Amino acid sequence: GKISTDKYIFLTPRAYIIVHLLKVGKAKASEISENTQIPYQTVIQNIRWLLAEGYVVKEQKGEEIYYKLTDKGKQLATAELEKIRKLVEVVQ
Amino acid sequence: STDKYIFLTPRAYIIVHLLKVGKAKASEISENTQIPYQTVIQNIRWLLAEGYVVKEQKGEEIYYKLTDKGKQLATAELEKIRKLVEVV
Amino acid sequence: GKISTDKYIFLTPRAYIIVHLLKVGKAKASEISENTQIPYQTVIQNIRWLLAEGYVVKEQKGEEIYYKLTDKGKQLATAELEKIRKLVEVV
Amino acid sequence: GKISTDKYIFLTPRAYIIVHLLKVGKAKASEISENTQIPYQTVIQNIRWLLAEGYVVKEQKGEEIYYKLTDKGKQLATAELEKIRKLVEVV
Amino acid sequence: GKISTDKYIFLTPRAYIIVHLLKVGKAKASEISENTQIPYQTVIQNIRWLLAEGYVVKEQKGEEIYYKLTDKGKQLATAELEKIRKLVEVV
Amino acid sequence: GKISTDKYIFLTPRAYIIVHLLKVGKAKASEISENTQIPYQTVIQNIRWLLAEGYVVKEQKGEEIYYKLTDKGKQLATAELEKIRKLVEVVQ
DNA sequence: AATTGCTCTATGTTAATCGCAGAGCATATTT
DNA sequence: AAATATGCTCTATGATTAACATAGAGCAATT
């Protein structure tokens, strides 16, 4: 699948997506996009996948739809983040 | 469905390996990262076309290594990778 | 909200999907996409949702991912199907 | 377009709407939203289209605008209702 | 290994692509593949080589991407091609 | 398969061999190698493929192994060459 | 000359990036 | 009170390409 493009040399689009939720805790699909530079279509495409994977859950208030990392989604993040520190430390 | 490349791309694992070793063969580049060989070369052909890597054929032995340009990309991207973790 | 749908006016693409899951039980994405004429891409984005609700389960078979309707999905299926005869009947 | 969402799993909002007019003859855009469980803005949206496609026509009842199906409407209902059965044929 | 080429038995798919850019000036991934009848994958993968050598360059026209031979690329397409005629006149 | 390479940019080794056989008429394995500069292990490999399709047949003229074209390899020689021309022609 | 072996090529199946056209609903408008 | 222009948000899905596996094939070295 299209994973390594000129825009995602090292990190994938979902990476920045999750890293964002880790901070804001909860955010709108639009808020995720404009804050990560990742185009909206790519965001929800990965959000749909995150939902099916149980990493992220959807919240709704009639009109306002928010997304947040589930406990396992937070487990995934704090796991992949440790592979980064490795990459970069083994490295230098 | 990629469970293998969640946060990191296979391209990264390749760039990094060519940093700690400097000179590596498409076969070893694959093994030491557990990335399917067919992906290695396919990414190599792209890295070559972008001057991020230069080939060095010492006979029948093939060797791919980072260039001055590719090295800059390596030390550049990696920094971006850290700053993203710092705040988190 | 300018509407133009010559394809989905009464039935959603998600419906045809659910249905095909009852016949074959388990099938790949590139598979049900052909037996329903529903474009492959649309299928994935819909099977994901069915996974997010637990209406379907991902069962890999070697290298090819297989999607099979679950109990809760079977419920949704048979339950929402009767909801359709409760309409056709009176009309 | 936005066909299948959380509320709509099998049938689109149009299916219901028409199914409503196919039982109440002519009802106000409000009274449809009342029975269809569909929000007001959505119904108006589908109506603005139904009328533009010669599927539905207004009927001026004085100080109100009850909406009634047209001959083109039944030409669509029964013509759509059959894709359901051809579909729910294997249950 | 073993040999079974049904197509490229005398010419490389690289030969075609090179020839194309020499008469078209500017071509995209699809264009080459569509005309040369060489499969898309082979093309996109061969340009990489023509780029790693500096024989071809990239013309970014908005979204779509074009490819054109370079100085060294031209001095290659006009040289090797001569060893073609030097080869056919040997008869 | 391994078709395009650093040397076989335009023509393949099977091209050099065949087109050279027409002129030279006939020759031994190593002879082909020396002339077209193509390594033996390569020349010998493709010859095996030629002796398999009938394009070329080996004829024991002494103790060496003489490799000379055939009819199957003639219908092909002119066939490929014809396309080779269709290519350099439109280049104009 | 034939088999073994390593490496890179040709290329199809699948999938994931990002775009355009929808379309579901909520507000602010509006005769 | 009911209707529309309007602003979001997510869906339908086509086009480009990457992930990567199969079948080659250029080229030593061994049998």
AA letter at A47:
I
Helix (H) or strand (E) holding A65: strand A64-69
CA atoms within 13 A on the CB side of B17: 21
Q: Which residues contact C75 (CB under 8 A, 6 or more apart)?
A: none
Q: How many domains does the structure of chain A reveal?
A: 1
What subunits make at least 3 CB pairs under 8 angstroms with F?
A: E
CATH of the domain at B29: 1.10.10.10
With vertex at residue A13, the alpha carbon angle to CA B64 and CA E49, rounded to the nearest 5 degrees, is 30
What separation in angstroms does the CA of F92 have from each of D23, D49, E19, E47? 74, 57, 10, 22
> Distance (Å, rounded) from C-alpha F92 to C-alpha F75?
28
CA of D14 to C1' of H27 (A): 68
What separation in angstroms does the CA of A45 have from each of A8, A28, A48, C40, E61? 16, 14, 5, 14, 27
Helix (H) or strand (E) holding C57: strand C56-61
| φ, ψ (nearest 5 deg) of residue E87 | -95, -30
Q: What is the DSSP letter of B21?
A: S
AA letter at A8:
Y
Beta strands in chain F (DSSP E): 27-28, 56-59, 66-69
Provide residues of C within 8 Å CB-CB of chain A.
45, 47-49, 51-52, 58
What separation in angstroms does the CA of A34 have from each of A2, A89, F1? 21, 30, 45
> Can you read off the two tokens belonging to residue F15?
């091209």
Nucleotide nearest to A64 (CA to C1'): H9
**Closest C-alpha to F54, from F40, F36, F74, F82:** F74
Sort D56 into a burial class: Cβ within 10 Å, 0-12 / 13-18 / 19+. buried
| Contact criterion met (CB below 8 Å) for F47 and E53 | no
> Distance (Å, rounded) from C-alpha B33 to C-alpha B39?
11
Domain housing D91: 1-91
Give the helix ranges, DSSP H, for B32-87: 37-49, 68-87
> Can you read off the two tokens belonging to residue A91?
């490295």
Way the structure was solved: X-ray
Which A residues 18-77 have CB within 7 Å of strand G?
38-42, 45-46, 49, 62-63
Helix, strand, coil percentages (3-state) for chain A, rounded to 5, are 60, 15, 25
Resolution of the entry in angstroms = 3.4
CA of D41 to C1' of H3 (A): 10
CA-based nearest distance C88→chain A, Å: 31
| Contact criterion met (CB below 8 Å) for F50 and F56 | yes
| φ, ψ (nearest 5 deg) of residue E22 | -80, -25
Look at the block and give the residue holding tokens 């050099």. F16
CA of D18 to C1' of H30 (A): 80
Q: Which residues of E touch B49 (CB under 8 A)?
A: 47-49, 51-52
